[PDB]
Design a protein around this ligand. Sequence first.
Ligand SMILES: Nc1ncnc2c1ncn2[C@@H]1O[C@H](COP(=O)(O)OP(=O)(O)NP(=O)(O)O)[C@@H](O)[C@H]1O
Ligand SMILES: *[C@H]1[C@H](C(=O)OCc2ccccc2)C(=O)CC[C@@]1(C)C(=O)OC
Length: 348
Amino acid sequence: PEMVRGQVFDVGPRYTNLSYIGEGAYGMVCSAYDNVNKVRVAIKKISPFEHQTYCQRTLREIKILLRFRHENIIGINDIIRAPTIEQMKDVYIVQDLMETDLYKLLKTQHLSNDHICYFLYQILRGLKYIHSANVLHRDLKPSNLLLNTTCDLKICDFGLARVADPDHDHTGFLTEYVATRWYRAPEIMLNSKGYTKSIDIWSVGCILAEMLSNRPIFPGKHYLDQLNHILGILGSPSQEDLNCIINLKARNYLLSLPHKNKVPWNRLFPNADSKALDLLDKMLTFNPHKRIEVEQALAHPYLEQYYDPSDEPIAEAPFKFDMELDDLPKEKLKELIFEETARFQPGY
Ligand SMILES: Nc1ncnc2c1ncn2[C@@H]1O[C@H](COP(=O)(O)OP(=O)(O)NP(=O)(O)O)[C@@H](O)[C@H]1O
Ligand SMILES: *[C@H]1[C@H](C(=O)OCc2ccccc2)C(=O)CC[C@@]1(C)C(=O)OC
């Protein structure tokens, strides 16, 4: 099997000429050539089976991405794994090949307002579809916004996604422990229940702020410091803001902090388009019930030159998992992953 940086990529003979792209906390990603379809692809290797939470990520990403079909969402082309469950230790997810991601892009170039506007449009267009399927992405960040040579944008990295169900979701706090928290809505860090589509709009607002200055807006060093970063710009929450915090402990914590004044957006972004700052303001609102929704964001004057509901597709029906996975042991999740990937095996 071909080796990349001392790592086995057992994807031949169909896929060859592997080249390292990058990696996340869980997957190593290579470009490759598909000799069957005569096209370039990306391949993500993950090795999840010793960790329940990693198994959850892998099963969610596979199930959701195979059901979604949208220009601004990465598709799964193929999945490689061993022919028996006992031999299966790695999973290779084959996707269309993108050229870079927005994290990498922002480290080497400043974006013009036209570029920012177009990228934000594509993010919200993809998000409109995700939310129309009643799915929460829950982990949007610059590194999982992929870009290609023609400057098309696709959202990837769905291992934290969940069906939106604030009234009946007793999953609790996020069980993701490695990746960044700079884009997490304040209610994600304060409450263990009741997450809505507004958590993704918060993330997009953080991404917009970062496109405007090439610096993350809330780069907290740890849990309480993240909160202080948010409050140091939005100012102390109002009385109505405080009611969204269901955990009276967390709310009394916030009440105990020293008062902080709001920082006007045009002090942070003095040269930015005022329409961009107006939309940003509506995306980064502490109260999730007051935060702008994805269709309202698309219809905002900042995006006027792109907004077109005739060309912004939605899902036919809301996505459903057919089972709750949070309490299944990893050995059961391994069976479900084996079953979910059998459709890519000969003789299914
Ligand atoms: N289809 C793709 N084409 C090109 N680059 C890709 C593609 N998928 C992923 N990448 C790159 O690989 C990186 C890791 O992918 P990702 O799916 O986020 O991995 P992960 O380890 O499963 N989760 P995370 O820790 O959140 O990044 C991305 O941030 C991109 O730079
Ligand atoms: C698109 C362009 C882009 O998306 O680049 C893709 C890429 C960057 C780096 C390495 C490999 C691929 C930009 O980043 C600038 C804005 C776009 C719209 C452009 O090029 O317009 C002229």
